């Protein structure tokens, strides 16, 4: 009966183990996949055990976000709690026909594809008014239908773009702070945009940008709708997350090396070669040896 040597995390023997949301989307962080940054729209396989490896998930490209304005960093850790996850295949609303007059869908050089030097997250549509509609608007209301299947939870991603005084006036017809509200599952949250004086770009595509993006998700339970009320600069949802079942999550690390009987929060991958262990009674997952006082 010895205290295990700490070791790397591993694949759980009888159980699919999720490290990154999308293995095969290299050049991508989890949060890049959760947002649908271009080059990060790939298969997100099911697993029944998942390792939580980023307490503060990070983007690494696309348009600069003001992360701390919403609960957005936590999206991929929410996702990893479900057994099954997928970006929807069809857009959840038609962006161009949305309330607020005709829109062109904006794109950015911070978001290169492979067909384009210019693009945007697949979860959202940057709703830019056509040039004859650009002016202040009264709050617009759009309903976001459910669109997932079986008992899937639907996570709906949306936001709003803001800029400095002059830029706001070109893009939209209004240099005033714009207002926004989301409501879904009984949860309501209000936002008001900011004009100029933005913090430094971080975790983004690395092209200089005058503006900033704010991004949120709302949870829609099966059958249930969501509502966005909005003015100028809105990012309307498009591809949404569909999510079902449950995965056990454990704090740990990557890469997952080889296979282990058990995953231990302090000792990492742990085979049940011996029946007991001593030391730190952390949280464990799988077929595990029994903890004992030294």
């Amino acid at each position: 009966t010895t205290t295990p040597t700490k070791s790397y995390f591993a694949n759980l023997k009888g159980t699919r183990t999720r490290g990154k949301l999308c293995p095969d989307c290299l050049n991508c962080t989890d949060l890049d996949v959760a947002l649908g940054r271009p080059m990060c729209v790939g298969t997100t396989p099911s697993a029944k055990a998942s390792i939580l490896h980023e307490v503060k998930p990070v983007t690494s490209g696309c348009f600069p976000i003001m992360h701390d304005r919403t609960k957005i960093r936590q999206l991929p850790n929410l996702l990893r709690g479900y057994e099954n996850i997928r970006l929807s295949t069809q857009n959840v609303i038609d962006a161009e026909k949305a309330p607020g007059g005709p829109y062109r869908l904006g794109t950015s050089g911070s978001c290169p594809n492979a067909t384009s030097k210019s693009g945007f997250f697949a979860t959202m549509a940057w709703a830019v008014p056509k040039d004859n509609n650009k002016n202040a608007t009264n709050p617009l209301t759009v309903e976001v239908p459910y669109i997932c299947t079986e008992g899937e939870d639907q996570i709906t991603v949306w936001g709003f773009h803001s800029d400095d005084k002059t830029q706001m006036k070109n893009l939209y017809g209004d240099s005033n702070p714009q207002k926004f509200t989301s409501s879904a599952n009984g949860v309501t949250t209000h936002y008001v945009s900011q004009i100029g004086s933005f913090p430094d770009q971080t975790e983004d595509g690395g092209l200089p940008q005058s503006g900033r993006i704010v991004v949120d998700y709302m949870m829609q339970k099966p059958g249930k709708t969501g509502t966005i009320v909005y003015q100028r600069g809105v990012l309307l949802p498009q591809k949404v997350w569909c999510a079902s079942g449950r995965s056990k999550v454990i704090k740990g690390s990557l890469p997952l090396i080889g296979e282990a009987d058990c995953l231990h929060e302090k000792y990492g991958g742990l085979n049940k070669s011996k029946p007991y262990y001593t030391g730190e009674h952390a949280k464990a997952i799988g077929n595990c040896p029994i903890w004992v006082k030294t």
């Epitope: 205290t3 040597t5 700490k6 070791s7 790397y8 995390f9 490290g19 290299l26 050049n27 991508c28 962080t29 390792i51 490896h53 980023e54 990070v58 690494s60 975790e203 704090k251 740990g252 690390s253 990557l254 890469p255 090396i257 990492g268």
Partner: antibody, heavy 125, light 111 residues
Framework: QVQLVQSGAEVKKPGASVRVSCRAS????????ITWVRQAPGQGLEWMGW????????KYAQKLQGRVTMTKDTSTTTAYMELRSLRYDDTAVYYC??????????????????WSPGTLVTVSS | QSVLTQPPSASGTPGQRVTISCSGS????????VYWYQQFPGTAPKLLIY???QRPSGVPDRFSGSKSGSSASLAISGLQSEDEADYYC???????????FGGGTKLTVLR
């Protein structure tokens, strides 16, 4: 073939800073990390810190927090180490090394593999 | 003053088996994996032993890793002229929140 190639030898007055470059080849950079280790002339090895090629997460040696910064660039699969406020004790060879760990808390459960040839930094007035 | 204690010198006539010790504490060698690196003058160190007992590919079975409590040891058997180098042990230290290196032992095969 796993390769690491560093920037050229440097010489600096005390008080200035150095940025050393480390370009990576032959493996999936975004699923590994870089550590840096330095070696004063005719002495032992001192661990400096690590940075993830997946997230840019860093952890530095306690003695060098404040003075050191590590960054990395997925595009060029290159990592950089910046050391500020150089004193004569900073004269050393700077190695980078491929580190197997790329996410989770950095806690030495993994290890570092291949070492680059080494870049010498001479702090002299 | 190194956290891990390595003798500065180890030696043996060619063909003999020499050992290099490495002495630590509970926070490092006691709870963590040991690693060994070999350095020839003016070259990068190379990974020789990993996770206390393993051999990277290329490393002959002549090299052997050992660990007991808060001390580890490197054994070089069938000693040969090309093993003249410096040998460093390394482990993580939970008390100092970073990797630690032994002072390095110089291996001389006496001639």
């Amino acid at each position: 073939q796993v390769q690491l190639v560093q920037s050229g030898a440097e010489v600096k007055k005390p008080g200035a800073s150095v940025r050393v470059s480390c370009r990576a080849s032959g493996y999936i950079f975004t699923e590994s990390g870089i550590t840096w280790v330095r070696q004063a002339p005719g002495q032992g090895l001192e661990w400096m810190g690590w940075i993830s090629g997946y997230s840019g997460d860093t952890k530095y040696a306690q003695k060098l927090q404040g003075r050191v910064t590590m960054t990395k660039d997925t595009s060029t699969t290159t990592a950089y180490m910046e050391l500020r406020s150089l004193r004569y004790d900073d004269t050393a060879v700077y190695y980078c090394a491929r580190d197997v760990q790329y996410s989770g808390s950095y806690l030495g459960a993994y290890y570092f593999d291949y070492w680059s040839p080494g870049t010498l930094v001479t702090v002299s007035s | 003053q190194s956290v891990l204690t390595q003798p500065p010198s180890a030696s043996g006539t060619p063909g003999q088996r020499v050992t290099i010790s490495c002495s630590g504490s509970s926070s490092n060698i006691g709870t963590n994996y040991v690693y060994w690196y070999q350095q020839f003058p003016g070259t990068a160190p190379k990974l020789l032993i990993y996770r206390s007992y393993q051999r990277p590919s290329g490393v002959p079975d002549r090299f052997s890793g050992s660990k007991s409590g808060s001390s580890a040891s490197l054994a070089i058997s069938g000693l040969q002229s090309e093993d003249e180098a410096d040998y460093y042990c390394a482990t993580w230290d939970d008390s100092l929140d970073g990797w630690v290196f032994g002072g390095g032992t110089k291996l001389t095969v006496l001639r």
